[PDB]
């Protein structure tokens with residue numbers, strides 16, 4: 001028997017879920033380790049992990065702020081008069097408010113530890129000495145002071161992921177989203193590099209808060225942003241992004257970043273194009289944060305990219321060490337890590353083997369306008385099924401007639417297995433699609449068919465009723481081939 | 487002859503237009519649609535597109551969108567937006583002008599549809615029946631007016647909608663109803679909405695945003711609490727949030743006499759003996775089936791005591807070739823329910839695809855500020871129909887509103903279930919976006935979802951809708967009709 005039942009390394013969405021359920025629902029001695037207790041430099045994350053501190057929660061408060069540049073512009077069309085020249089955004093006030101809010105969640109979690117018997121927080125760098133001994137050192141350097149040594153039954157690794165760096169000359173003058181949450185002034189000219197959702201979301205933020213002559217550029221090495229998402233939506237989002245002032249640059253990737261005399265960055269693009277920017281933000285990928293846990297010391301196998309390898313039940317190759325969340329590089333989303341933490345406590349401390357279903361998980365992109373997506377994209381479904389039907393509706397929501405932002409089309413598209421009518425993926429662009437898609441993913445867990453959609457009576461006037469208005473396929477794929485008739 | 491027309495539709499509203507257009511376009515019949523007017527406005531208000539396009543859903547939602555801006559411009563200050571907050575002014579004439587050109591564009595679209603659907607024709611005037619195979623198109627509602635046309639038809643479809651109800655009181659002619667509210671040339675300073683339904687609570691939101699600076703909007707309603715028929719908790723939260731935004735909710739209040747002051751404004755004396763004075767007194771206390779000028783006795787069609795045309799599952803009347811759909815039948819009064827009914831009618835009769843419209847678990851949204859999204863049964867009803875009811879409840883302030891300053895804005899979702907098998911019987915939400923969330927929840931409820939279907943879906947974060955998936959434990963129960971607590 002050991003001093004601790006469970007030692008969780010990482011106090012994030014996964015680790016906090018597993019830690020609280022094991023101590024509370026199962027009366028275990030759980031020790032949770034994290035570097036920091038309040039959000040901020042030097043480690044950015046703290047209690048609550050990347051979601052609370054430098055992820056979902058601060059980013060969404062900041063996208064809600066970014067949104068008012070649009071709604072103040074659009075109130076003109078509904079008769080709201082005001083001195084439009086006085087309208088100035090204020091970055092410092094936004095950052096102060098954000099900071100205020102995340103500090104509350106940090107304090108919420110000291111309360112959780114202080115009120116759960118068996119749950120204790122232990123601040124520092126956790127590293128493995130063998131599969132029953134976790135060390136808490138002062139810093140990642142394996143020659144720093146060990147602050148305490150914990151003897152334990154099971155170990156759960158929930159260390160998350162870290163921004164990926166480009167190895168170009170000048171990478172150290174670029175920032176990543178961690179530092180974007182702590183900037184002092186909003187950049188007048190900014191470069192976001194990557195076409196994934198963290199890039200697009202931050203481009204929407206910077207675009208709203210820049211000084212009046214400013215410009216935001218989004219650079220992407222590929223052909224069209226947001227690879228892996230539905231093509232048509234990717235095409236449509238690129239236009240609304242450009243219609244709000246962003247210079248989307250595809251097939252573009254930086255080569256050298258140099259600091260200019262004033263402190264701005266001089267980028268030389270792989271194309272030979274050059275430009276100067278107040279801030280260059282690297283949002284090119286999040287890599288699994290496993291590289292300093294001394295996993296080698298306990299025999300845990302990691303992947304090429306550093307992902308800790310785990311089976312369906314999150315077990316590694318060492319029988320009492322499990323790993324969950326982003327470090328396992330399965331679907332990197334907060335709900336998915338929370339699920340995995342709950343399954344693990346059932347598997348290990350309740351002996352109810354549970355496995356997280358990583359399929360049909362729905363996700364949103366909080367761009368302006370937003371996206372809400374779930375299940376297959378037609379190219380994939382087309383590969384796995386002989387007859388796929390694709391449905392799509394597109395319309396400007398009426399308020400946008402009167403508002404002036406006529407470039408804002410709501411778009412909804414549905415991919416089905418044409419044989420049985422089962423819905424395989426629903427993809428949406430427009431406001432409120434993050435909210436609409438949550439209820440759509442429930443339908444998709446239950447095996448909804450397309451007649452289940454169009455036999456439901458609509459709620460009018462709403463965009464979401466278009467989901468129940470599509471009864472005829474726009475086109476098909478018969479045996480991998482796009483086709484118009486079957 | 488043969489019979490000159492296949493179907494004559496009286497009423498070019500939601501269900502009428504659905505039927506007339508599907509029957510001619512898809513089944514090639516010769517269809518005559520009758521309406522009083524081609525473009526919105528006085529004197530009839532409703533025109534092509536009916537009540538919803540001209541004086542109902544579409545104008546009301548645009549004016550609700552405008553009304554919202556009072557709160558979004560207020561709330562931007564918490565997120566660092568700086569502006570001359572003194573200079574903010576609503577301008578009602580600009581709202582009505584924009585609204586009016588958005589509605590007239592839709593009237594032009596319908597016009598084009600008659601122009602290019604071969605077989606479909608608009609006929610204009612008052613439609614009345616002569617016998618079950620002859621519709622008269624008269625000059626006006628008067629049974630004596632000149633009859634401009636006589637249509638010899640096989641089928642008659644009655645899709646005439648409903649109309650505002652009036653109080654019997656002295657002064658009733660000084661009050662307006664929602665038809666005129668869409669046409670006010672000046673937003674009222676002080677205004678009273680009487681009624682506790684969705685139209686009333688909706689116009690209190692609109693007048694409250696556009697009033698001049700010291701204005702007041704009062705909503706009077708004779709019951710104990712507004713929006714009878716909805717979730718009890720949600721009616722308490724909506725009343726407090728209405729109040730928190732400046733609307734004075736006077737319950738157990740009903741006008742007794744309205745009189746005109748010298749200055750123009752109206753003086754209302756409540757039955758309580760309370761009295762006040764207002765620019766506008768709007769009455770939103772009920773909608774009557776509009777069937778009285780039709781001469782249904784000539785064809786022998788039976789109507790309910792409130793004017794509702796009595797119909798069966800297939801919308802057929804007691805006269806076999808006459809059918810009725812939409813609000814004139816008084817089943818569920820909503821545009822999507824009339825549309826479904828219209829399409830089911832053309833399948834049954836012309837496509838030999840018999841379809842009764844299902845009127846259970848129809849979702850509906852109340853576009854108040856904040857809005858509500860509702861589908862299925864309220865717990866007090868479920869408790870009378872099932873021996874074991876569990877209520878799951880969750881309410882939270884979006885952290886958005888900690889920063890925004892509107893801390894009164896609680897989001898709330900309440901789920902009612904049959905506790906034996908855990909099927910979800912009703913989902914009821916209050917809060918922003920709830921009308922977009924409930925549509926997709928109505929699909930789950932028609933499939934027969936159980937609450938394990940909800941809490942085993944992985945959430946999308948950060949959203950309000952993800953509370954639907956984070957409810958695992960019942961708050962209290964109803965065992966054999968009594969609110970129990972451990973079951």
Ligand SMILES: Cc1cc2nc3c(=O)[nH]c(=O)nc-3n(C[C@H](O)[C@H](O)[C@H](O)COP(=O)(O)OP(=O)(O)OC[C@H]3O[C@@H](n4cnc5c(N)ncnc54)[C@H](O)[C@H]3O)c2cc1C
Pocket residue numbers: 009010011012013014015033034035036043045046047048049050051052054055056057059124125126127158159160161177198289292293324325326327332333334335337947948
């Ligand atoms: C900018 C951005 C936006 C995002 N937005 C969304 C969104 O809106 N929705 C969504 O669902 N997902 C979003 N994500 C992702 C989401 O934050 C992650 O999926 C999720 O937090 C990962 O969960 P986790 O349990 O693996 O731990 P994480 O939440 O990353 O937590 C990891 C924890 O381990 C700690 N740590 C690291 N190594 C050690 C060590 N040796 N000792 C001790 N502690 C250590 C980190 O300090 C710590 O906080 C976003 C991510 C980013 C970066």
Ligand SMILES: Cc1cc2nc3c(=O)[nH]c(=O)nc-3n(C[C@H](O)[C@H](O)[C@H](O)COP(=O)(O)OP(=O)(O)OC[C@H]3O[C@@H](n4cnc5c(N)ncnc54)[C@H](O)[C@H]3O)c2cc1C
Pocket residue numbers: 460461496497498499500501502520521522530532533534535536537538539541542543544546611612613614645646647648664685776779780811812813814819820821822824
């Ligand atoms: C203020 C308001 C807001 C509403 N908001 C919503 C909402 O957001 N969502 C929703 O689902 N529902 C809403 N409704 C209800 C919805 O508008 C109606 O349920 C729907 O339009 C009814 O469809 P209908 O086919 O019965 O006829 P209607 O659309 O009312 O059409 C009736 C048609 O018949 C014509 N007519 C009547 N008598 C004759 C005659 N003798 N000859 C010729 N023509 C005649 C009327 O002029 C004509 O427009 C609202 C209604 C109002 C009043």
Ligand SMILES: NC(=O)c1ccc[n+]([C@H]2O[C@@H](COP(=O)([O-])OP(=O)(O)OC[C@H]3O[C@@H](n4cnc5c(N)ncnc54)[C@H](OP(=O)(O)O)[C@@H]3O)[C@H](O)[C@H]2O)c1
Pocket residue numbers: 166193194195196197198199220221222226227253283284285286331332333363364365
């Ligand atoms: N919508 C969702 O919520 C969702 C979606 C997907 C993933 N995830 C998850 O995955 C994480 C990382 O997100 P991310 O936004 O950083 O996106 P990611 O999609 O890998 O973003 C990388 C982007 O940069 C490009 N890129 C990658 N490596 C590059 C390189 N070396 N040089 C140049 N460009 C390069 C990629 O182009 P290519 O696309 O051509 O590689 C892609 O456009 C999230 O934190 C995690 O939550 C969530």
Ligand SMILES: NC(=O)c1ccc[n+]([C@H]2O[C@@H](COP(=O)([O-])OP(=O)(O)OC[C@H]3O[C@@H](n4cnc5c(N)ncnc54)[C@H](OP(=O)(O)O)[C@@H]3O)[C@H](O)[C@H]2O)c1
Pocket residue numbers: 653680681682683684685707708709713714715740770771772773818819820850851852
């Ligand atoms: N949420 C929705 O979308 C919703 C809800 C229900 C129905 N509907 C649909 O069906 C309809 C009828 O619903 P409604 O809400 O308008 O119905 P209603 O109850 O007739 O609405 C009238 C409102 O005024 C009150 N009232 C009625 N007669 C009164 C009188 N003579 N004296 C004083 N006040 C009186 C009613 O109170 P009491 O309740 O005390 O009578 C209620 O508060 C609508 O036309 C229709 O579009 C929609």
